[model samples]
Target chain A: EDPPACGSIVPRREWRALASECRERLTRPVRYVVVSHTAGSHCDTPASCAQQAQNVQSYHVRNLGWCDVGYNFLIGEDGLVYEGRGWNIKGAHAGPTWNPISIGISFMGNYMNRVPPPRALRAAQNLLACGVALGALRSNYEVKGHRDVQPTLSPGDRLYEIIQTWSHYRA
Target chain B: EDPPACGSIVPRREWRALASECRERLTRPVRYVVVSHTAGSHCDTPASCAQQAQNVQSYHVRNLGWCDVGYNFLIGEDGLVYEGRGWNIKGAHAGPTWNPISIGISFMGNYMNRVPPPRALRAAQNLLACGVALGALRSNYEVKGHRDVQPTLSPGDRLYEIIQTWSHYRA
Candidate 1:
């Protein structure tokens, strides 16, 4: 059966995602949602954002030598969600400790100083809700920053602060 | 000879950057500087910004599986610059066409609707000056928003408008 949908995610085909060889799977009912940012570029339009998604995958596959884009999903400032590895596969986001048990949802821009638009933020929260609905994540899945589990500054400071205030956030 | 110093840049070592295996190089005396935003997080303090830099590298190296962070340098809201691939390496920030010829300097946060602080802007300009001084970039380098070369909303709407007023900016 096709994996359950997680909100309004732009399927890999829609964004022209590169073919991937990664086949690792994650255990069901993920307990964590590790948020991150692309720290690359942000797109505000569907046409541009689709190209942005392709660029990300190209970097991962051609440059980094990865099988595909790393995150389970990516959120664009255009307020649309883009599929990465999707819900069932283990993502390369976070560290080894968390990758197997968590869903990685990265925003498609940096957020250290300024915050994402309300529409973008709403898209992310709604994505999480859909994950819960699809049974891909636990109803009580804990939200954490990429920095919380790894030695990097992901999900940007401004974005991190907002996530902390989310109802599902756990310290 | 060592590259000319660009303002106060936190070295990768200070931020505990991962050992990179990337070996690509860009041709010297580049003629373009493409501006962008991380859309991840922002930091205003030295300690926090340092962490922010590390986080960016972590995402690039660990998650994205890149040889190193993509940008040539990163500007922090804390008013300091953080070293990424530095001035010598070919960055993966801009797309292939521009990546080979342009230097990419990404601000460490999203600037779509909000403007970056004065200190952040100063750091970026100073960095460009240093690039020119080092002869790594042409003296008359053209500045372009990330969106100009590729189909993305990077650099951001507000930031894009600000750069348009720069003396070196081109359509």
Candidate 2:
């Protein structure tokens, strides 16, 4: 567990995360992945992106009064995946039904009008593959745009459009 | 108990509500009340407000997949409190901790920049008094804006400010 296989996830300590208080665990191997966008500022540098991850977690824990950040993983334009609830813990993303059964991966910024740089896209895909390798997600797991299952515009239009072309996306 | 003596709380049947299946109950004489807004269209007429209530319940049931409307009671701009899960069930408005311990009463329209009419405000206050009268709320029950306890901007800015001035509001 020195570094997870497939994608080297940025550990919470590496990003200086506030210790999480969430205890709800996702029953592995989850069958779904819900992709979303932070809809906030996006960062392209490792230092800036690391701060962005901290900012998102702070808002979730401090503002939302939740135990931890909402996503299972957050991808940065710096081409890295930041750990959220990780693979085995349930996340606050999606609603009650979708949250427990899915891995929520949110890209670091709004992607309604623009697409994530190629490296960022690859990082998310790699993270998904790692989930399979870790036996945290089913081999045949399905990907969903956040809007598809919830009543909000998330994952943005450009990103949502892109995820549909992935091999595992179902609706 | 005809009309419940305080206000004419339009029952589910009067609104032509879809059958609700929520089985969860709140421990009686609950200690808190959370005030919120529908954050959707606000209706000021009986016919339209009644329809708005139906639409909210439908979305919660059919879309978010909650057991019923998320609020324990919904107040219309038309100035009547519409029955939801009533005073005995937990509401979905305030999140995990507050939801179970509070009565949730929502204004039927967005209140960020706009304030509700006098009657709508009166309706909510009346409903709280009714809750206490019905032995469903403690006499010392506290009132809270939805934003005070949850992360989202639920009861909007203007409405949130107004609720803060309410006699029972805490923090």
Candidate 3:
């Protein structure tokens, strides 16, 4: 058995993430993709975004008391995706009902009043395609805004709107 | 010369709030009151809510690195208003444009899919009335949902709807 070939995802080690003991398997070929936003800081440079990625993980692990960063992956303004829970593990981003069944991909920063830069948006799209290619997400997977299933204004208004236009997004 | 007489507002001392060295003063008789939600855990008992209040202050102080908890006051489901920046100091809840001009009062829990109990709602109304009486707020002060001015969905859907029915809400 071989690990799924993926994208330009920065591994946890590269981002200096704290070691995690995350358990719970995501039953594969997940049908849902939840998009969210960190609602925190944004970074443009690779180094800065990498550190921001580390900070997100630290906040989740230390403050929120999660095993790791809540998302399966985090898209940075640096036009890169940072690995979070990865393909096989269940994430804590969405609520219990959806977390075990969906892949959560969050953009780094508050996107309520603004939109992520073009590069960042493209990075997220690329990551989705990678997930589909790796057979981790079904080819017909539905994209859902974090707010769709949770009582949150997450993914942010602007970002949520953009995701709805994606080929895979559904109600 | 009297400090504003208010509601059954819990003093920072009673909550064992950390001493804050906040310096900016909010111009008196502020014309706006922005209602928001802590968007965190909810507590139904006095002791639990008090500790939750402290946790909020700790996050803003230790994590977000703010001078204190961001709101001017926080309402608990236990039917009490917990003092934050109080009437005289500037708050951090709303962003730069609104922070200096408005009083920010946040509910203690996420209110998107749920409504606060009747007593909690009454506590907020009482706090508003007390503010008007104390002269910290103009007699004709306008009530605004946090989302009205900020790009946030705070004060959540259910609570935001309730606030609109209040007499002072302008839009």
Q: Between the candidate structures 1 and 3, which one is better when assessed by TM-score?
A: 3
lDDT of 1 by residue, A49-100 (tens): 8998898888677755667887899888899999989999998776556889
Model 3, runs deviating above 4 Å: A1-171, B1-4
Q: What is the lDDT of residue B90 in candidate 3?
A: 95
| Candidate lDDT values, in order | 0.83, 0.85, 0.86
lDDT of 2 by residue, A134-155 (tens): 8899999999887676634478
**Pairs of residues clashing in candidate 2:** none
Best by DockQ: 2
Off by over 4 Å in 2: A1-4, A35-49, A63-66, A75-80, A94-97, A107-126, A143-171, B1-5
Interface RMSD after interface superposition, model 1: 10.2
CAPRI docking class of candidate 1: incorrect
- Regions more than 4 Å wrong, model 1: A1-171, B1-6
Candidate that would win on TM-score? 2
DockQ of 1: 0.04
lDDT of 1 by residue, B7-94 (tens): 6788888877787677898888999999988766778887888898888887777765678887888898889888888877888776
Superposed Cα deviation of residue B30, candidate 3 (Å):
0.5
